[PDB]
Amino acid sequence: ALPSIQLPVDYNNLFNEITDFLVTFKQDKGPKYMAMLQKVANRELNSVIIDLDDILQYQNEKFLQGTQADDLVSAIQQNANHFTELFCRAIDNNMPLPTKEIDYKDDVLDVILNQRRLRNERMLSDRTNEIRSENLMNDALREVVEDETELFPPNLTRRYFLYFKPLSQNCARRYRKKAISSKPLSVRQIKGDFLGQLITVRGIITRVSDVKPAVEVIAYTCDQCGYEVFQEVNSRTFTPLSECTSEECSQNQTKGQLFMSTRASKFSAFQECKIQELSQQVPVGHIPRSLNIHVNGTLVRSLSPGDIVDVTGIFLPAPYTGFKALKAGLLTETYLEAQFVRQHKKKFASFSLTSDVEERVMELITSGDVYNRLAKSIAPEIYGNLDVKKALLLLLVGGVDKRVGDGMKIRGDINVCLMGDPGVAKSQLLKAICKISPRGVYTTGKGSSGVGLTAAVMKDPVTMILEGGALVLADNGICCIDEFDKMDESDRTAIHEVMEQQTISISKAGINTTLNARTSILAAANPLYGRYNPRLSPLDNINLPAALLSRFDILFLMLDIPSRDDDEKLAEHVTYVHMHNKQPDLDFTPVEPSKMREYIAYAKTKRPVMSEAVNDYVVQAYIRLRQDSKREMDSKFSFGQATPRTLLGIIRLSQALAKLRLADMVDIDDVEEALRLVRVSKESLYQ
């Protein structure tokens, strides 16, 4: 009964060689990870990051200089779960322990482990005194002390954590080895044979839960024998235990009666979410599935919902089956444990490094004529509309704010509407804008109702929260909106509530919340039946009241005059699209969006300040606008009224225009550009 199997996997010399690689590494002053371990011993960091490349670099290094190394990349790659603690107990062999005197305000966790380090040694110092005092080289005298005393386990006092990291193909491109762990694989590609492996998946973060502590081990005070009982739980649920389980309360008539304790237990950060399929490699008639991923420890609070992320980890089952009668006997429900996060579309306001950044940013700066180059680069796949692209470049900036303090804020947001139909292909840009921009949700007219894009209340799974909508999702980002003309009339009311910032009021059956939203609005509606009748007026061919048009600072019109000379360049434009896969030729090179947004995000941290001469230039220029707008008062081609919100925008615009100079140099040509985009945006209906 119960036979045994030998396998080529060893645990002995692998533990020996993994000690040497943990010690002997010099390439990337002294040893790399010991200085990191001294930084861990500095008690200022909680994570340990292990690559696979320096392993493979070492594995290249040992064969070329010495006889033979045991393979260790594919060794970890197979089972990958026993390599957690068998690696980590070798770390505690070597440690620069007293490297800094403890701070009084360091950590309440730190003062507890310092006790259990010291209480271990003082208990160790007692037993070696009694044995030498009762005699009848001292290694066996040391060894007698080792087994006659109950101690705290070394698993109980750790204070740090370790996360693995998958290898890139880049070093695998030089020397091909077991690079199977890092491929963009699908949930459909997850066959049930990849259990225990280390994988790489990607998708969309959907229905993120909340972070709440997970109990791991529980302390138990005796109060009679004075020991501490410890119970490790790896199940879903558990039980409290009996009255005592001491060795000294044992073999005695009166046992104790215990109770647990809070401050001595060890907890863990816990939160999970679900990943939906990428919706690009899905077969032609299928519906995307989901997958459960547990997240533990340091990496928590790092995954916003509705993103694109590369998740790598190791693939483990959970003991669970479905309904009671449907159980075929051994039903294994799986999950994935998160190990490393690499996000596509790297989020702004999260970097501070500038040196390797300005290694490429200064080359963009020293390229010359940058501001005209930018709007050429965002969605260049149409012809013309450069001033139209120029304003949308400025929509990408935004990024200004001011509160007077004990008062009100001002919203530094731009709201550009688009009018015209149909051969301008506006939706080619509408998909392009929310694609490059981080936190970009593409929305339609009817597919969200008045309750859809706002929040909702449903029963919480395992961890009655407010499940939010798209505008709840796409805060601090830009919402792309199709066909505002066909919304619900109640859905119009919420949009007016965004033009005053952060306001979403709810007076439903049990909900009285006023939730906040740092969103941004782009809208595009179509004109009336027919197309551009000069017999029709402004607001005659418009299906919306002008109070909503007063809330729009910037408005465009998409004319289509069939002109003879404008076609031949546009004909050569569109035919060149299908000849190749790139439009510009010998005059321009496009900016890739990843390098583009980093220059944007660095420009988002400037906050230019105005001056006094630019104060003088704007005031009389507003008297220019206020005087000639109020001399018509008609339903003619000119619009009716000029708001003070027009001045609120154009001050904010030249402020945002100063941000692309990155210099806090609000000047005369700063404002000179701002007036040009006002008079051309309006009244382009002359031809």
Partner 1 sequence: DDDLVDKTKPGDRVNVVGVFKSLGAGGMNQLIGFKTLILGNTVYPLHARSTGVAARQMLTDFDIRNINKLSKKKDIFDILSQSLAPSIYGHDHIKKAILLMLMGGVEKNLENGSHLRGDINILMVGDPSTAKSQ
Q: Which residues pair with 334 in a beta bridge?
A: 317
| Alpha carbons 45 and 163: distance in angstroms, whole number | 13
The reply on whether position 577 binds partner 1 by CB under 8 A is yes
From 581, 586, 612, 631, residue interacting with partner 1 (rule: CB under 8 A) = 581
DSSP string, 542-565: --S-HHHHHH-SEEEEE-----SH
The reply on whether position 327 binds partner 1 by CB under 8 A is no
For the bound state, the minimum distance from the C-beta of residue 288 to partner 1, rounded and expressed in Å, comes to 12
The reply on whether position 431 binds partner 1 by CB under 8 A is yes
196 is in an annotated binding site: no
Q: Residues near 566 by Cβ (< 8 Å), separated by ≥ 6?
A: none
Q: Which residues pair with 221 in a beta bridge?
A: 228, 259
526 is in an annotated binding site: yes
For the bound state, the minimum distance from the C-beta of residue 591 to partner 1, rounded and expressed in Å, comes to 12
For the bound state, the minimum distance from the C-beta of residue 257 to partner 1, rounded and expressed in Å, comes to 42
Q: Which is nearer to partner 1, 463 or 589 (CB)?
A: 589
Binding mask 134-173 for partner 1 (x = CB under 8 A): ----------------------------------------
Q: Do the beta carbons of residue 296 and residue 270 sit within 8 Å?
A: yes
Q: Do the beta carbons of residue 658 and residue 608 sit within 8 Å?
A: yes
228: phi then psi, degrees, rounded to nearest 5: -130, 120
Q: Which is nearer to partner 1, 384 or 545 (CB)?
A: 384
For residues 18-50, one letter each, b for 16 or more C-beta atoms within 10 angstroms of the residue's C-beta and e for the rest, the string is beebbeebeeeeeeebbeebbebbebeeeebee
Secondary element (H or E) of residue 242 = none
426 is in an annotated binding site: yes
For the bound state, the minimum distance from the C-beta of residue 327 to partner 1, rounded and expressed in Å, comes to 12
From 428, 493, 589, 635, residue interacting with partner 1 (rule: CB under 8 A) = 428
Q: Do the beta carbons of residue 464 and residue 457 sit within 8 Å?
A: yes
Q: Which stretch binds partner 1 (CB under 8 A): 33-41, 43-51, 102-110, 425-433?
A: 425-433
CB atoms within 10 A of CB 191: 8
Interface with partner 1 (CB under 8 A), residue total 13
510 is in an annotated binding site: no
Q: Do the beta carbons of residue 56 and residue 167 sit within 8 Å?
A: yes
Q: Which of 358, 387, 350, 383 is nearest to 372 (CA)?
A: 387
From 578, 612, 686, 687, residue interacting with partner 1 (rule: CB under 8 A) = 578
* CA 565, 566, 572, 574 torsion-angle sign: negative
Helix then strand count (H, E) for the chain reads 20, 20
383 is in an annotated binding site: yes
622 is in an annotated binding site: no
Q: Which is nearer to partner 1, 582 or 679 (CB)?
A: 582
For the bound state, the minimum distance from the C-beta of residue 576 to partner 1, rounded and expressed in Å, comes to 12
For the bound state, the minimum distance from the C-beta of residue 190 to partner 1, rounded and expressed in Å, comes to 12
The reply on whether position 412 binds partner 1 by CB under 8 A is no
659 class by beta-carbon count within 10 Å (0-12 exposed, 13-18 middle, 19+ buried):
buried
The reply on whether position 381 binds partner 1 by CB under 8 A is yes
From 593, 596, 611, 682, residue interacting with partner 1 (rule: CB under 8 A) = 593
279 is in an annotated binding site: no
The reply on whether position 286 binds partner 1 by CB under 8 A is yes
490 is in an annotated binding site: no
| Two tokens, residue 261 | 């304790």
Q: Which is nearer to partner 1, 427 or 490 (CB)?
A: 427
Q: Which is nearer to partner 1, 571 or 609 (CB)?
A: 571
Q: Which stretch binds partner 1 (CB under 8 A): 1-9, 76-84, 279-287, 564-572?
A: 279-287
From 48, 172, 198, 432, residue interacting with partner 1 (rule: CB under 8 A) = 432
- Angle between helical axes of 386-397 and 370-377 (0-180°, round to 10): 100
Q: Which residues bind partner 1 (CB under 8 A)?
A: 285-287, 379, 381, 428, 431-432, 577-578, 581-582, 593
Q: List residues forming the annotated binding site for ATP.
A: 383, 423, 425-427, 526, 551, 645
